Design a protein around this ligand. Structure first.
Ligand code: CL
Lengths: 82, 70, 257
């Protein structure tokens, strides 16, 4: 497990293998900090990690994304290279 | 296989499991060195990788830009 | 024998101006309801279209084979003719499924013509029984710049012909170029047609299309965000992405540039 820390103070603990989904994180890699990415975005990023790993080797379901978080989420994905 | 979000104060653990409530308390112990749902004291339909079930609020997303409204 | 039809066919704008000043009628039709305007559009003769419209030619007359000036202009490929008819209120969707301008323009890869039909309110997803969508024909006919145009404009990447999707039709073709494009715009690689088959199953054994349909597991989160954001805009409104507060690199990514 590794700890990903969001802009607004939240702490997310996810399995290291899953976080490596991010090029940026894989490269930086016990604890990581993201002064620019807020919790409501970073939680979705982690879910995408779970989703990516679980379905990365076999029918795949829709990954829901509310329009209201999409722009910030795109920036996060861009920075995180995932 | 079932995918949880175990939440408390400003921390959040993301983790999967099969299996009783008892043995999940042990996994937490594994992470946050403490010893052993909704307003109370979890399925493939109900808790998916992309939509973990939850076991402090997150930030409030900003206003949808005007050009993206219907 | 009509002098006016005859001049219109061959693009003889002088003979045409002449006949008109000698008193020959501009709205004159064969037994098949072909007019000079129909003939001039068919040959792409912009001068003669101008002349005929300016002397009151009818822009929506329908021939016995269900053809309209706009349809014929789409056959010829003259963007200018198409534009000018649209300016003059040429109706975008004619009644017959045998003569849909946008389909004819799309099947021959007349991109600019397609672009203009859509701009003037044509239904980019119009789905005809024996044909499918304009996107579908462009694909069958390997018209790459049409396909790219239709998708940028926001055509429905998954609406093809009957149960046969665009990605299916592209796999028969083996077009690597076009498959990659459909997928960039989120074609469903798992849909099954009327014969029960998924698109990867239609693809020659020797093609890299297989590895490609298989390797593409879920898309990146970036790709997923792009689908989602584009989905918020209507046909040909995606340019408004320009207004968003967003790095230029990403506006271009969202706009597929
Ligand atoms: Cl190709």
């Amino acid at each position: 497990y590794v700890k990903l820390i969001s802009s607004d103070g939240h702490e997310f603990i996810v399995k290291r293998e899953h976080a490596l989904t991010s090029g940026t994180i894989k490269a930086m890699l016990n604890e990581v900090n993201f002064r620019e990415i807020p919790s409501h975005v970073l939680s979705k990023v982690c879910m995408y990690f779970t989703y990516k790993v679980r379905y990365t080797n076999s029918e795949i379901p829709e990954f829901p994304i509310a329009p209201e978080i999409a722009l910030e989420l795109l920036m996060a994905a861009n920075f995180l290279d995932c | 296989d079932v995918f949880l979000m175990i939440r408390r104060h400003k921390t959040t653990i993301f983790t999967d499991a099969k299996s009783t409530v008892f043995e999940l308390k042990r996994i937490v112990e594994g992470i946050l060195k403490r010893p052993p749902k909704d307003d109370q004291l979890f399925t493939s339909q109900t808790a998916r990788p992309q939509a973990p079930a939850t076991v402090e609020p997150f930030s409030s997303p900003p206003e949808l830009p005007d050009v993206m409204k219907p | 024998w009509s002098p006016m039809h005859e001049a219109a066919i061959h693009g003889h704008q002088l003979s045409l101006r002449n006949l008109i000043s000698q008193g020959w009628a501009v709205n004159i039709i064969t037994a098949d309801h072909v007019s000079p305007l129909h003939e001039a559009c068919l040959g792409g003769h912009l001068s003669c279209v101008k002349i005929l419209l300016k002397h009151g030619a009818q822009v929506n007359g329908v021939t016995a084979d269900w053809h309209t000036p706009l349809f014929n202009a789409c056959v010829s490929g003259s963007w200018d003719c198409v534009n000018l008819l649209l300016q003059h209120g040429a109706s975008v969707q004619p009644e017959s499924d045998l003569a849909s301008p946008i389909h004819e323009a799309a099947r021959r890869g007349h991109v600019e013509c397609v672009n203009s039909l859509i701009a003037y309110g044509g239904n980019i997803d119009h789905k005809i029984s024996h044909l499918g969508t304009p996107l579908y024909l462009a694909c069958e006919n390997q018209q790459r710049a049409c396909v790219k145009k239709l998708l940028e404009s926001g055509a429905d990447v998954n609406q093809g012909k009957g149960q046969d999707s665009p990605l299916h039709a592209v796999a028969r073709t083996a077009s690597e170029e076009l498959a990659c494009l459909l997928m960039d715009f989120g074609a469903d690689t798992q849909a099954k047609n009327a014969e029960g088959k998924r698109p990867v199953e239609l693809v020659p054994p020797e093609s890299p299309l297989a590895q490609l349909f298989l390797e593409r597991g879920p898309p990146s989160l970036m790709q997923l965000c792009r689908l989602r954001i584009r989905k918020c805009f209507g046909i040909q409104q995606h340019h408004k992405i320009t207004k968003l507060v967003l790095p230029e690199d990403l506006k271009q990514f969202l706009l597929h540039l």
